[PDB]
Amino acid sequence: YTMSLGAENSVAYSNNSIAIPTNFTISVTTEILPVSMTKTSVDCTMYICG
Amino acid sequence: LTGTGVLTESNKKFLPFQQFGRDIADTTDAVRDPQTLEILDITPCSFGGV
Ligand SMILES: *[C@@H]1O[C@H](CO)[C@@H](O[C@@H]2O[C@H](CO)[C@@H](O)[C@H](O)[C@H]2NC(C)=O)[C@H](O)[C@H]1NC(C)=O
Ligand SMILES: *[C@@H]1O[C@H](CO)[C@@H](O)[C@H](O)[C@H]1NC(C)=O
């Protein structure tokens, strides 16, 4: 299928209407970031030749 | 099949037709002794960086 980018949402704009929230939600979300790699070393002579 | 390593007793049970053993990286880590049919575990000699 041809993918859909998202649901249509026509915001009810006018020149004298405002939307004010009457409530709120406390949202907690995760963000995962890699920090470090595995530290490796090579004995180059031993790898190439043994 | 020659190499350098530390030969130690092993709990691995080879099938009777197998002689050598390899790990996921295809390096010989276990060998069956041809004289006495006992499986010997090969550990590389403990190298390191100074
Ligand atoms: C704001 O939203 C919260 C929920 O996020 C509302 O709290 C709920 O209220 C209903 C009915 O009053 C209860 O049945 C729920 O158990 C409540 N949930 C929680 C988590 O407390 C709250 O009433 C809303 N306030 C306004 C003014 O709309
Ligand atoms: C080879 O000689 C050893 C020496 O004791 C013996 O134990 C073994 O049974 C012989 N035969 C084979 C097939 O290894």
Curated annotation (Swiss-Prot), chain B:
Changing residue 25 to D: In strain: Alpha/B.1.1.7. It comes from the Viruses. Attaches the virion to the cell membrane by interacting with host receptor, initiating the infection. The major receptor is host ACE2. When S2/S2' has been cleaved, binding to the receptor triggers direct fusion at the cell membrane. When S2/S2' has not been cleaved, binding to the receptor results in internalization of the virus by endocytosis using host TFRC and GRM2 and leading to fusion of the virion membrane with the host endosomal membrane. Alternatively, may use NRP1/NRP2 and integrin as entry receptors. Binds to host ACE2. RBD also interacts with the N-linked glycan on 'Asn-90' of ACE2. Cleavage of S generates a polybasic C-terminal sequence on S1 that binds to host Neuropilin-1 (NRP1) and Neuropilin-2 (NRP2) receptors. Interacts with host integrin alpha-5/beta-1 (ITGA5:ITGB1) and with ACE2 in complex with integrin alpha-5/beta-1 (ITGA5:ITGB1). May interact via cytoplasmic c-terminus with M protein. May interact (via N-terminus) with host bilirubin and biliverdin, thereby preventing antibody binding to the SARS-CoV-2 spike NTD via an allosteric mechanism. This is Spike protein S1. It comes from Severe acute respiratory syndrome coronavirus 2. The lineage of its organism: Viruses, Riboviria, Orthornavirae, Pisuviricota, Pisoniviricetes.
